[PDB]
Amino acid sequence: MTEYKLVVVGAGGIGKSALTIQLIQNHFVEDSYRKQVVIDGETCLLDILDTAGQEEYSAMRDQYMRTGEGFLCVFAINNTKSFEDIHHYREQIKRVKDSEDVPMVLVGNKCDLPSRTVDTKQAQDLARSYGIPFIETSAKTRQGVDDAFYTLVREIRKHKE
Numbered sequence: 286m287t288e289y290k291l292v293v294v295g296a297g298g299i300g301k302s303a304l305t306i307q308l309i310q311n312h313f314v315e316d317s318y319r320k321q322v323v324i325d326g327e328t329c330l331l332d333i334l335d336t337a338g339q340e341e342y343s344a345m346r347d348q349y350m351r352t353g354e355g356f357l358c359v360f361a362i363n364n365t366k367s368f369e370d371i372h373h374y375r376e377q378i379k380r381v382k383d384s385e386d387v388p389m390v391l392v393g394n395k396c397d398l399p400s401r402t403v404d405t406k407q408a409q410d411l412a413r414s415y416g417i418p419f420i421e422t423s424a425k426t427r428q429g430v431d432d433a434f435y436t437l438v439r440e441i442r443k444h445k446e
């Protein structure tokens with residue numbers, strides 16, 4: 286069965302770990318988290334890299350990102366800076382994968398909160414500009430979490446063929 290190495294990138298404190306845990310362990314409270322799932326009727330293995338890789342010095346951080354086959358570009362809907370930083374994380378991913386068409390999904394996390402400084406339309410527009418999907422998620426309530434990772438797998442599959 287096919288394995289998909291997935292990388293979750295974005296500003297600190299936005300729920301990248303919480304999203305991964307919600308997907309793997311189904312609750313909200315070393316190198317990788319692995320989980321077998323059925324996507325589009327096909328059994329596959331998700332290999333989600335631990336985000337501690339984002340703490341590495343630059344050369345080793347590039348190596349960690351070069352390893353991913355698809356990327357969740359995550360921001361939090363109550364964190365303007367994290368949304369601004371999407372641009373900078375997408376440019377880093379393109380540089381390290383040496384490609385302008387990397388499988389990616391834009392994820393707006395913490396949609397359970399009332400404090401929303403980044404509007405849905407802002408994010409939808411950005412994802413349209415990039416030509417990638419946009420998913421709203423809450424790692425707390427689990428809204429959209431499966432949808433986010435499954436959509437990324439579907440994007441990888443289309444990229445292959």
Ligand SMILES: Nc1nc2c(ncn2[C@@H]2O[C@H](COP(=O)(O)OP(=O)(O)O)[C@@H](O)[C@H]2O)c(=O)[nH]1
Pocket residue numbers: 296297298299300301302303304314336394395396397398422423424425426
């Ligand atoms: N309300 C809410 N809090 C969240 C959500 N996801 C993460 N958090 C909280 O945001 C903080 C940062 O989460 P964390 O997973 O460490 O972020 P990371 O630094 O991007 O890995 C923690 O206090 C989480 O409980 C979410 O969807 N909703």
